[PDB]
């Protein structure tokens, strides 16, 4: 969606900014409609819900006797819905306003807390705005800082704080926005460290072994002397196998009437597996691994094959 | 931990003292067979600890005693027995109020221990040195009644 927004910095430097979504975990378009057997009509089923008090199974009237509560320790506050809209934290609106600027390493790769990654571009046909944004972008780039902007899709949406990363491509410079955590969201854990490995002790035989490994299985290696490594596993251009399986299933279930489902088409598996050459390179290094570590046992589970014939 | 301690003390009283604070603190937590073992550890050394009556009412020893579990009851009445000479009367009254309950109980061994308790009460409180302690008089009366 062409979302335009006013990139706000200060109280007097508004810029029309066009927001665009870059990466979103795609969800299949239309849900599996629930249908009754042996009649195959959608309209024959009602997922009706009923609310019943615990005493003697008294049924309570559907949508005007229930008022939502919350747990606050032992007891339940009778909150409501009307009180909800009366006390909910308001907001002005889009309010994509820059809180400040900070160093690259001041934010870290790990901490990104987003649902989705926006791309933050200029509202079209206002050139001076575009160059203004471009100035912004280069300046952040060479000075190697990032921006932290209050974000909000709109009213009735929770506000949002995160990094504004600035990006460059020979066709165009780019600026992208990601959720970064609020404090309540961050978690903290001890995680007893490892360089106290008085119980694990990675001996040099193991050390140089793993060296040989991670070199040997190098999924990427430089090509064309341009340092464009052998990234013949981009994973970026690779279709989501989930959707592949889903459309395949729908197919075989259409082209045939009732027949049992097929296995995964071997080209999908070939697709997901690494290009063979890595597997070819892999046997000897792993081979030396198997004699250089302890590998005490583990467990396993079952299926319908637990009692399925053949 | 309780099991280990019990097995230790079962032939060695002295070691208990060093851990008996924990023995008590852990008491009300457990339920079931381990309770028996815990109170047994308590028994092994009950003859020495001072201010045991307070510490013992801390955990609901009175309510602990009422439970239908023969071994738990046997160890509880034995606890009563040993701490008998040391406890002041004003509270031996409250402590015998549930001991007297065990007249109706069926575990023959349990009743034998009851009558031992009440024997001792009767022997050592007959005609107290002072009549003012209405507590003492009442204890004597109740003991006599149940023993009859």
């Amino acid at each position: 969606i062409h979302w335009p927004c006013r990139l706000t910095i200060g109280s007097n430097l508004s810029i029309r900014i066009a927001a665009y979504k870059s990466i979103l975990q795609e969800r299949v378009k239309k849900t599996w409609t629930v249908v009754d057997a042996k009649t195959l009509k959608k309209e024959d089923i009602q997922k009706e819900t009923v609310y019943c008090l615990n005493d003697d199974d008294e049924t309570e009237v559907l949508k005007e006797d229930i008022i939502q509560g919350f747990r606050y320790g032992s007891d339940i506050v009778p909150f409501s819905k009307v009180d909800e809209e009366q006390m909910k934290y308001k907001s002005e609106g889009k309010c994509f306003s820059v809180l400040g600027f900070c160093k690259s390493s001041q934010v870290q790769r790990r901490f990104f807390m987003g649902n989705q990654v926006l791309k933050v571009f200029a509202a079209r046909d206002d050139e001076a705005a575009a160059v203004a944004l471009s100035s912004l972008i280069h300046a952040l780039d060479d000075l190697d800082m990032v921006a932290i902007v209050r974000y909000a899709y709109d009213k009735r949406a929770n506000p949002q704080v995160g990094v504004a990363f600035p990006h460059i491509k020979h066709n165009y410079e780019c600026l992208v926005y990601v959720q970064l955590p609020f404090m309540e969201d961050l978690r903290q854990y001890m995680f007893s460290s490892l360089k106290n490995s008085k119980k694990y002790a990675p001996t040099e035989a193991q050390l140089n072994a793993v060296d040989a490994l991670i070199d040997s299985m190098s999924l990427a290696k430089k090509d064309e002397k341009t340092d464009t490594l052998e990234d013949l596993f981009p994973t970026t251009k690779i279709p989501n196998p989930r959707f592949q399986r889903l459309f395949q299933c729908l197919l075989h279930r259409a082209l045939h009437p009732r027949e049992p489902l097929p296995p995964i088409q071997q080209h999908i598996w070939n697709m997901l597996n690494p290009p063979a050459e890595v597997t070819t390179k892999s046997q000897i290094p792993l081979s030396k691994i198997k004699t250089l570590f302890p590998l005490i046992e583990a467990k396993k589970k079952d299926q319908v094959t637990a009692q399925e014939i053949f | 931990f309780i099991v280990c301690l019990n097995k230790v003390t079962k032939s060695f009283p002295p070691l208990a003292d060093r851990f008996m604070n924990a023995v008590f603190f852990l008491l009300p937590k457990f339920h079931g067979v381990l309770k028996t073992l815990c109170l047994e550890v308590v028994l092994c050394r009950v003859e020495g600890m001072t201010e045991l009556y307070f510490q013992l009412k801390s955990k609901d020893f009175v309510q602990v005693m009422r439970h239908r579990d023969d071994e738990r009851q046997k160890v509880c009445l034995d606890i009563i027995y040993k701490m008998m000479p040391k406890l002041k009367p004003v509270e031996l009254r409250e402590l015998l109020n549930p001991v007297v309950e065990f007249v109706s109980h069926p575990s023959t061994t349990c009743r034998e221990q009851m009558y031992n308790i009440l024997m001792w009460i009767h022997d050592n409180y007959r005609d107290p040195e002072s009549e003012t302690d209405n507590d003492s008089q009442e204890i004597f009366k109740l003991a006599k009644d149940v023993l009859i």
Partner: protein, 497 residues
């Protein structure tokens, strides 16, 4: 520590005539200070760790109630999960009229004996049934010598306190306030785990923080397999989660009871009741309808046995930050499943960090789930500030995106800037720096929701109406930057808006 275990904090205030009415000046009051502390920490714990345990018990009082019927100790509310019906009780005492009520209900402050007081608190922690993770006792007194008079009481005190130290209980007092008499080497250097008249440690116990926490809970343990034969035991842990508000519960008008939703599915043609077997899933493509078994509608996803599938390794420049998909997770071996695997994990970690390259893998978090491609970017530990864990050592999980995600952008042309305005924008961007710490900000929504919750819970006169750093401080930007907005207007802006 044992997860089901819980953190328990008992509260214990000096109820003598000592500080009930010290009020040297007319700005605070030590009892009104301690009660404020207790109310504050308790409401903080309500939201924070609603599962924990608290208890409040005063000592030296004239009335009496405790488990053991001792003298001058009063257990205000026993150890129980926090709840409103208790904040109410504490609040009943906050105030000059409140302190009149406190004194005329339980006592002005009689004689006491901290030996016995600690006895009381000990019995309290004992009485609870659930398991206790940490056990902590907070005195709120100031008589920095509990008693210089009867030393025997003092010997008994040191003895029992050592015991409590040995029974697994810690103890801590914050020296509240005393004219002079603001020392801990007088009788407490051997109790708690230089000195002044007010405690910093009690300041933060008013900071009034209200997030929530969960312990070291493994999100899922799966076996990273290098190949079809080598496997290691990894615990997929989580390090950022986007706490949504606690899910509301449905209640009846007339009685505030739970209402036990009872959704069901049933027939329209007849008043029948479709049992779960008697349903079918469906789609509509190509004007033709489709049927699958409800079992099949999830069988259509079985792709790999659960775990991690490391394939190769990849130069960290190539794992572009430009394509985040979901919050990252963390990787750290769990010695429990495949014994010794922690070694190999460490080996991979050390070597990869040394040779500055990623590790790509297939992630099947649970059964029935399609796999995604995630990279095991290693992470070095950092401790420098105070030698406390900051970034835990191991591998990240940067999920790599799939082709169905790129969302082809509506191409537009570029217009470079002139070095003049970018040279000034250098100054602009320099001026508005600020160091960004991780926990800088808060959700206004979550925070305000929690607030309004306490508001409705405690029958307050007002909501707290928190002010939250999310909104920018406008005047600050107007000032610290100067009027450069008109500079960039005259540089790169014509009349039109």
């Amino acid at each position: 520590y044992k997860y089901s275990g819980r953190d328990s904090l008992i509260f214990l205030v000096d109820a003598s005539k000592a500080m009930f009415e010290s009020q040297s000046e007319d700005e605070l009051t030590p009892f009104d200070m301690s009660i404020q502390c207790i109310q504050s920490v308790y409401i903080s714990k309500i939201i924070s760790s609603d599962r924990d345990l608290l208890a409040v018990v005063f000592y030296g009082t004239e009335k009496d109630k405790n488990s053991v019927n001792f003298k001058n100790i009063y257990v205000l509310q026993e150890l129980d999960n926090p709840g409103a019906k208790r904040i109410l009780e504490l609040d009943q005492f906050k105030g000059q009229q409140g302190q009149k009520r406190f004194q005329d209900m339980m006592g002005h402050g009689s004689d006491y004996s901290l030996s016995e007081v600690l006895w009381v608190c000990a019995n309290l922690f004992s009485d609870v049934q659930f398991k206790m993770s940490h056990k902590r006792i907070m005195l709120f007194t100031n008589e920095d010598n509990p008693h210089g008079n009867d030393s025997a009481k003092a010997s008994r005190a040191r003895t029992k306190a050592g015991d409590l130290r040995d029974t697994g209980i810690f103890l801590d007092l914050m020296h509240l306030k005393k004219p002079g008499g603001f020392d801990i080497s007088l009788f407490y250097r051997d109790i708690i785990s230089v000195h002044f008249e007010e405690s910093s440690k009690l300041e933060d116990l008013l900071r009034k923080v209200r997030a929530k926490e969960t312990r070291k809970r493994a999100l899922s343990r799966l076996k990273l397999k290098l190949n079809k034969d080598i496997v290691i035991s990894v615990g997929i842990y989580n390090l950022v989660q986007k706490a949504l508000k606690p899910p509301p519960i449905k209640l009846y008008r007339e009685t505030n009871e739970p209402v036990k939703t009872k959704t069901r599915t049933f027939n329209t043609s007849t008043g029948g009741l479709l049992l779960p077997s008697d349903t079918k899933r469906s789609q509509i493509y190509g004007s033709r309808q489709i049927i699958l078994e409800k079992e099949e509608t999830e069988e259509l996803k079985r792709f790999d046995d659960p775990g991690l599938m490391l394939m190769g390794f990849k130069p960290l420049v190539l794992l572009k930050k430009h394509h985040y998909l979901r919050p990252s997770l963390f990787v750290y071996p769990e010695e429990s499943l495949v014994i010794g695997s922690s070694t190999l994990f460490s080996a991979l970690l050390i070597k990869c960090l040394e040779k500055e390259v990623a590790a790509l893998c297939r992630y099947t978090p649970r059964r029935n789930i399609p796999p995604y491609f995630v990279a095991l970017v290693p992470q070095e530990e950092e401790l420098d500030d105070q030698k406390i864990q900051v970034t835990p050592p191991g591998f990240q999980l940067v999920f790599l995106p799939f082709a169905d995600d790129k969302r082809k952008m509506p191409f537009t042309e570029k217009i470079m800037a002139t070095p003049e305005q970018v040279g000034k924008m250098k100054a602009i961007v320099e001026k508005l720096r600020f160091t960004y710490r991780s926990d800088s900000f808060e959700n206004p929504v979550l925070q305000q929701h929690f607030r309004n919750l306490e508001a409705l819970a405690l029958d307050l006169m007002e909501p707290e109406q928190a002010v939250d750093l999310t909104l920018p401080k406008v005047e600050a930007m107007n000032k610290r930057l100067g009027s450069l907005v008109d500079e960039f207007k005259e540089l790169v802006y014509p009349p039109d808006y």
